[PDB]
Design an enzyme around this catalytic site. Structure first.
Site: not given
Ligand SMILES: O=C(O)c1ccc(C(=O)O)c(O)c1
Ligand SMILES: O=C(O)c1ccc(C(=O)O)c(O)c1
Ligand SMILES: O=C(O)c1ccc(C(=O)O)c(O)c1
Ligand code: FES
Ligand code: FES
Ligand code: FES
Ligand SMILES: [Fe+3]
Ligand SMILES: [Fe+3]
Lengths: 154, 129, 403, 389, 154, 154, 381
Positions: B35, B46, B48, B50, B52, B59
């Protein structure tokens, strides 16, 4: 460095001592040659020296608690100190000048809760044997008025 | 901060992750490896809206609040900035909530592709545990 | 029905209703505070320069007290002659003239209306009628007396002179303390949970004071007395050693002191009706001002004093001995609470009477302090101002005989 | 000897006792607030839907005001007809009916008693006598009038219509500001340390506006030398004061836009005994003045925009609102001056206010160096209170 | 990263500035394009935008202090702020939102002490050139009532 | 070691839950077999066991909030908690015994702000799944008087 | 007049009775210092010689104390000198009482036994020859005790506590207080209402099921003594932690609720195993004080005592039942703000002031006003 966390921890123990009526331990927060005074913003702004309480030794603090126990007549009440975060104006590893906001509630044995005083502690801290101690604490009250009397120190 | 492999294993062990919800210590170390590469400050935007955050790439639509994600649920009830600290406490407490959600460790895509069903105990050997 | 009925001509009985009756409180404002008394305002040294003012109260009535360019002191009611606003909003300051904030009327330092905003209207519209004359509108002015730096004011032009009001013994006893220039070293207010009269009786209560003094001697031979002026309104309570008679504390410096008066007096408390106190307790000097606030509340304003000529060491003695007085005083602390103990103890007894019989039914000076003569004196002066002596029907029912 | 004794037929002298006498304050409740007046309750747009209600006061008396399914607005005394409890406990809500929490008596939106718990007893025992009739018990209902969205209530069957009470000039001056749909943009309460009448006189005091408030004079918003006027209705109870037109790092505080046909950049309007409608440039508001104790009153601010405001017009009103309310560059002073009077007269209950600017006139005037609208208030007051001559 | 310690330190300096009458420094706690508003829980819950104070620039803050000094008529009084701990609601690498409980005592020059306001600061913080600054501070007051007037900002 | 910062952070989240009327979350601050009591200094000094609220399970806490929502009639109001710094008497990495000063303002929906309660929490903390939890919280009130009623827990 | 009664009946009560301050002063003269018994404390609170409490009878402060004879005395807490409170502590143990102001000393009966400096100091001052200590003292109260309850009266003419209560109230008290009780906690509620609104509330059997929606077959009733002043209301045969309402049998009858009132301010409650006393005191025209004394029996096991500590959640300031009782009085006080000249309607169960089967009645409320009007001289023929 004396820091804001150490002074906040000392201030919470000071408050707990006064608010629990363990008044015999109150003088131990001070150096032998300390200054303690309770005054108000008007006296402080004009440079007037007198206090409601005025002490230039730890022994004067002890004698005030002796008189509180054995001599003074007053209706039963307690304090609740609510303190803000301290600000350090100047200092090093062993000395600091600092200011702490305070409010004191008075609770009578009969149940009435009042804002009894508020203001700031204008403090000079030193270190004795590794531990924080007050060389000076001036309780500068926001108000010129004390309701009824003041028995317990601020 | 960049953790050592074994440094992170010991920290995750001390926060009670060994076999948490059935998942052995090595799954958690392996998850952080793919990760974040053991980087507490890792961030991945991301497409969208969002992002992380942190060592377990948690998220900002479902789990933490970063203040810039439309439809934030904030189910760990923490600011995403809490997941970018040197100390892994907030990320571990949030991971325990995610992994309890019904989907287990499958919420972590890099874990699913690189760790799931491998010899994840390899991630904890050569370490004082 | 009446809870303020006096039992007879004597003051050995005081009706407890006198501490709770609100109609009577309003009569106190008309007949005492705005009557033939002298109200303590401030020290002259607190307003030393031209334009320096303070605000205070005479009873319920707010006052301005101000130094002018002639070096005289004036005082007037802090009430705009327009719609009644406070004129001066600050506790203290320095000004050329006083201007009401509401519609900008101007007052000089005597209280005379000098300016009315738009008095003559705008263009030729509005303003005051031709009949309106500024010199006919103004707050009430006070008659001002300065005695040993103490500034008193009266609403009445017919009040006796401050010298006659005090009498010679009280005059000398004030001059003894205020014999040289004084400096304010601190101000503190106590809000008292009692009718003003309970605190003023307490100042005059040599019985309570000598009980409390005797208790502290647990921790040199002395004698005491009480002086009461002719009106009853003013007292002195004192304790003294005989200079040249032959014979607990971890920091005894609290009570270490120095000789500075040409007499043996260790303690002198002096009261001037209706609310002034001057105190000398060893080297502890102060003035107090007592103000009524509500039927069951009053305000005590402390002015702590040093002498302008004090050395560092003498001033420090006063700063230490101040621990004996004020809101936290080793002596005065209970003086803030005893009045409230009475206010509450009489809650179901508005129709009963205080018993004040120590030293007989006397209202004169006495040797010793186990007396209430100075408390009865207060009620003598009170009843005269208030018109509450035996008059008319009740006097007739007593004196309608032929023995 | 009375501290409320009037010194003559005119209102150039007002007895200071009128601000402290408690028996007189109780007569104000009977003869003004529950008498021949209209009491401001709320805006219709604050209770837009069926069942929407607010609680408020008419003087000391708590009120419910509510929209019904017919789209009409009703108002009644918030007092259960059983043992006197408040019926509605919430500041606002939406309900089918009102139920007293104490013994579950039910009221409809008109205030009629519809239901009494255990009226017919429980298992044949207790309950009301046969003689008990629900229709004979209920809180007092108010007459309701709506004018340009303003909801007023009266206890009095005899008070004129809201149009006749206000009079045609006040009607037109309200319509001038409330000419289109309004939106509440904020509510704030100011607790005033003074008798209600000192604040209501202050609103009517055209004399003080340029003298108390440096902002009105320094920034040439409301000078006595500007064109303007005072209007007083026929009763004296209602007024209008109107006006036409130290530095600032952000002059946007006072940047505005034109939106009234006349040139009028200030209009303050009062309706006896406690309603204010304000237009100060683009700052619009309603105020409701309530008596609370002899020396305390409550000022409820309702800040308004128009429903059609652009982002930029709305932002101008949010900025200009810094002028008004509890922290207003103007209004903060209006909250304090009342208390300065209440305290200034503390030794003077037997003396009189002097109100002589513009003569002993209680009519309209050009120019604002007058107290005609203050004298008007006392004319309307003395008539309601039976204190003429 | 902005954290709870930095925000606690900033909030104590903000309180000390407002409580000391160094009101000239109050605008420096804010960014150039800031928002400051004083409102109440009712307005906040209904989404109503107006404030008893409403500022969308640092210069509007400076103007409010100028008015307080030179222009406005109000009776002399002081504030005493007693603050709770900041709680960070949202944040990323650089920005944070937070809520801080407050209580403000008002002490009149005549000595009366009252609880004048209480509530939470709803804040948006940024760090520019090493300084923590408010992009936004909304003082959401628990009460819809202001006693007499509000001269000093919360 | 559980320290004063961690306990202060827990206490601030507890306060925020109660003061926001998110009352459904209040029980989650406690263990399943917890003790919660509201009492006063007189009861506590005499060793009297009753509370205004008395709970020996988390489920008793949940039921009290269910009753608050569906059953109890009271006038709308909120709390504002102001907390002092905790004092730790004992503990370790998992458990701690500590005392925290508090004050609670009550603000009625009609605008009145009063000091409703003050005192200290006498707490026993445990750690469940890495998070602080109250095994025990005794809210010892300074006053024997509650104004009108107490609907919300302290 | 806002205190004008509408009739001989008590189906109408003038709302002015809750706001008229002259009338409040008459209540102090004619009720609290009249022909009533005022609840002072429990015997178990002053068990030993010298044990005292301070309290009030209406506005009048009171000292109540146990002497060496095992009897209880009470007197007005007012020094006979200048009127100071004599005892400043809520409770304690003493040989004698001393006024702190000028050290006058009182015995446990309230007799003045010592006057500081009575004979002067060094032969100067002191009281005149005519001054006699035995002529000066606070008013003494008559004390009566009943099953551990201590009552006081100012009146020489008040009946015995048994005759004042009447036989039904006596039996209903003895049923609860049949063995020694122990205080398990004290709490005060400050009520924002005239005292009478709370006392009516305790007597209001009508409200019990309606104001308190907590439980929501078994039957109940209302008993009213002959004066009207005293009542009993009685009843006889979802939660994640049902232990709240788990209880144990300890009364011979099946009575699960008994609320009992004694004019003008005493309440004894039994709700399952929850036992308490309440004392109602007037404070100002629109304020009163409710003092709770929570009780166990001295013979309780640990398990029975835990049941009482859990069931206490029903009562007191935060009670699942009594919470609303603290507020409803205030709702009335405010609801009538514009209605001083109007009347409460009290017609449930007719114009009756007697006992009734069932609880959909206001008979015990009307009883209160019957006893009130008699003490106050407000009866119409
Ligand atoms: O000795 C006295 O008679 C006496 C009286 C009053 C006071 C006082 O401080 O009020 C005092 O200190 C002494
Ligand atoms: O010019 C006036 O007559 C006037 C009066 C009142 C106000 C007010 O805001 O209350 C105002 O702004 C102006
Ligand atoms: O059933 C009743 O009549 C009743 C009345 C009062 C109370 C009370 O607790 O005050 C109660 O519990 C029950
Ligand atoms: S009240 Fe002072 S100028 Fe008008
Ligand atoms: S008071 Fe409303 S139903 Fe009884
Ligand atoms: S008042 Fe009690 S001894 Fe004087
Ligand atoms: Fe104005
Ligand atoms: Fe009940």
């Amino acid at each position: 460095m004396i820091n804001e966390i150490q002074i906040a921890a000392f201030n919470a123990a000071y408050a707990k001592t006064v608010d629990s009526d363990a008044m015999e331990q109150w003088p131990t927060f001070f150096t032998k040659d300390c200054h303690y005074r309770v005054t108000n913003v008007d006296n402080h702004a004009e440079g007037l020296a007198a206090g409601i309480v005025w002490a230039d030794s730890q022994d004067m603090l002890t004698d005030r608690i002796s008189a509180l126990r054995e001599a003074n007549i007053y209706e039963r009440h307690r304090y609740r100190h609510i303190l803000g975060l301290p600000s350090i104006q100047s200092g090093d590893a062993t000395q600091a000048s600092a200011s702490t906001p305070f409010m004191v509630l008075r609770i009578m044995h009969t149940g009435e809760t009042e804002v009894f005083a508020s203001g700031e502690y204008l403090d000079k801290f030193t270190t004795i044997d590794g531990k924080l101690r007050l060389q000076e604490r001036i309780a500068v009250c926001d108000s010129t008025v004390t309701d009824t009397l003041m028995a317990l120190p601020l | 901060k960049v953790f050592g492999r074994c440094e992170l294993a010991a920290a995750m062990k001390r926060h009670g992750l060994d076999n948490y919800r059935g998942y052995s210590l090595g799954n958690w170390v392996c998850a952080a490896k793919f990760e974040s590469n053991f980087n507490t400050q890792a961030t991945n935007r991301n497409t969208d809206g969002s992002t992380d955050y942190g060592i377990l790439q948690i998220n900002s639509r479902w789990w933490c609040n970063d203040g810039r994600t439309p439809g934030s649920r904030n189910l760990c009830n923490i600011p995403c900035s809490a997941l970018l600290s040197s100390d892994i406490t907030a990320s571990v407490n949030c991971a325990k909530k995610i992994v309890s959600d019904g989907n287990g460790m499958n919420a972590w895509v890099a874990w699913r592709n690189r760790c799931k069903g491998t010899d994840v105990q390899a991630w904890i050997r050569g370490c004082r545990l | 029905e009446s809870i303020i009925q006096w039992h007879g001509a004597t003051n050995t009985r005081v009706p407890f209703g006198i501490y709770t009756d609100t109609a009577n409180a309003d009569q106190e404002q008309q007949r005492i505070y705005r009557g033939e008394v002298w109200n303590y305002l401030c020290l002259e040294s607190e307003i030393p320069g031209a334009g320096d003012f303070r605000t205070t109260f005479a009873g319920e009535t707010p006052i301005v007290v101000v130094r002018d360019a002639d070096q005289e002191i004036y005082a007037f009611e802090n009430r705009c002659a327009h719609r009644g606003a406070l004129i001066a909003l600050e506790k203290s300051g320095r000004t050329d003239s006083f201007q009401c904030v509401y519609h900008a009327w101007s007052y000089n330092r005597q209280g005379d209306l000098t300016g009315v905003a738009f008095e003559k209207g705008v263009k030729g519209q509005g303003g005051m009628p031709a009949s309106f004359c500024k010199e006919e509108h103004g707050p009430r002015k006070l008659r001002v007396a300065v005695f040993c730096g103490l500034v008193f004011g009266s609403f009445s032009e017919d009040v006796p002179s401050i010298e006659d009001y005090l009498g010679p013994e009280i005059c000398e006893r004030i001059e003894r303390v205020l014999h040289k220039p004084v400096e304010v070293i601190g101000r503190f207010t106590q809000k008292l949970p009692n009718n003003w009269k309970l605190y003023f009786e307490n100042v005059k209560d040599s019985y309570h004071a000598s009980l409390l003094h005797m208790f502290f001697t647990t921790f040199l031979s002395q004698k005491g007395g009480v002086i009461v002026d002719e009106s009853g309104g003013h007292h002195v309570s004192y304790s003294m050693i005989d200079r040249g008679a032959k014979d607990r504390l971890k920091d005894p410096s609290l009570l270490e002191g120095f000789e500075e008066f040409e007499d043996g007096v260790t303690l002198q408390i002096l009261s001037v009706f209706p609310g002034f106190v001057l105190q000398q307790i060893q080297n502890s000097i102060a003035v107090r001002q007592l103000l009524p606030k509500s039927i069951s509340s009053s305000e005590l304003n402390w002015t702590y004093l040093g002498y302008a000529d004090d050395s560092a060491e003498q001033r420090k003695v006063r700063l230490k001995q101040a621990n004996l007085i004020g809101p936290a005083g080793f002596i005065s602390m209970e003086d803030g609470a005893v009045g409230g103990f009475v206010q509450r103890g009489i809650a179901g007894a508005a129709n009963l009477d205080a018993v004040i019989e120590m030293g007989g039914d006397h209202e004169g000076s006495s040797e010793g302090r186990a007396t209430e003569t100075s408390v009865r004196g207060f009620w003598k002066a009170y009843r005269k101002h208030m018109g509450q002596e035996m008059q008319a029907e009740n006097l007739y029912f007593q004196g309608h005989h032929h023995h």
